[PDB]
A paper describes a structure:
CypB is a peptidyl prolyl cis-trans-isomerase (PPIase) found in the endoplasmic reticulum (ER). CypB plays a significant role in the triple helix folding of collagen. It catalyzes the slow cistrans isomerization of multiple proline residues in the collagen chain. Here, we present the crystal structures of recombinantly produced wild-type and HC-mutant CypB from the horse.
A missense mutation in cyclophilin B (CypB) has been identified and pointed to a causal candidate gene for HC. The mutation alters a glycine residue that has been conserved across vertebrates. The HC CypB molecule demonstrates the same overall structure with the exception for the very short N-terminal region that precedes the mutation site (rmsd = 1.31 Å for 8 equivalent Cα positions). The catalytic site remains undisturbed in the HC CypB molecule. Strong electron density is observed for all N-terminal residues of HC CypB. The Gly6->Arg mutation in HC CypB appears to endow greater stability in the N-terminal region, as residues Ala(−1) to Arg6 in the HC mutant structure have higher occupancy values for residues (~0.7 vs. ~0.5 for wild-type) and significantly lower refined B-factors (5–12 Å2 vs. 9–20 Å2 for wild-type). Thus, the Gly6->Arg mutation causes significant change in the structure (up to 4.2 Å shift for the backbone at residue Lys5), with the wild-type side chain density of Lys5 being partially occupied by HC Arg6, and the flexibility of the N-terminal region sharply reduced. In HC CypB, the binding interface is altered: CypB overlaps with the P-domain, when superimposed, such that it could adversely affect binding. The Gly6->Arg mutation in HC CypB has two consequences; first, it adds an additional positive charge to the polybasic stretch, which is involved in the binding of the polyacidic region in calreticulin and thus can enhance the affinity, second, it significantly distorts the geometry and flexibility of the N-terminal tail and thus can slow down, limit or even eliminate binding-competent conformations. Binding of lysyl hydroxylase 1 to HC CypB is fully abolished, which establishes a more important role of the N-terminal tail and a stronger requirement for the N-terminal tail flexibility.
Numbering used by the authors: -1 to 183
The structure:
Amino acid sequence: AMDEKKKRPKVTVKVYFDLRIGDEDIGRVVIGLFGKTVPKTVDNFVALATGEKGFGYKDSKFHRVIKDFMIQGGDFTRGDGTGGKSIYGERFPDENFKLKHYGPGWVSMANAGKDTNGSQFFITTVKTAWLDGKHVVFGKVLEGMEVVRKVETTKTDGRDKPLKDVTIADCGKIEVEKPFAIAKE
Ligand SMILES: [Zn+2]
Ligand SMILES: [Zn+2]
């Protein structure tokens, strides 16, 4: 079907992450970001990817990995899940819950309850509907889902911490010439 009448979010900007497991380069993940739907949340993530406020994601780790669920990172202050901050302060409100965790590859803010978004985020590896309405969804992996799956399946300990550090070796912003809609899947 052409799906003329299905409602869809638009990718307005992209971020790339070049990832490593231990000292091995494993490839690039490119995330499309929904800047018309959740501008405040996207602007935070993009600024943290560029490092332009003097802090950000470069060389931070994915400190919590759960196979058949998600990979979580973004704690660039403590690297353990206790830290991170947004460009608006330590915490900012949930912007909206317009988007859901529709399937593998959706990118969403980690939190410790209502209105506690900072810098930590996760990339789902399955549909995670139980987080809908609780975590703010703001992007989707468009390239490099296979690289996400390498992280997803890395050996972890009983606290879900990778045995070898999984790091964002490089990251930044990629401009999108013309915003484009994607399926809610
Ligand atoms: Zn080596
Ligand atoms: Zn939660």
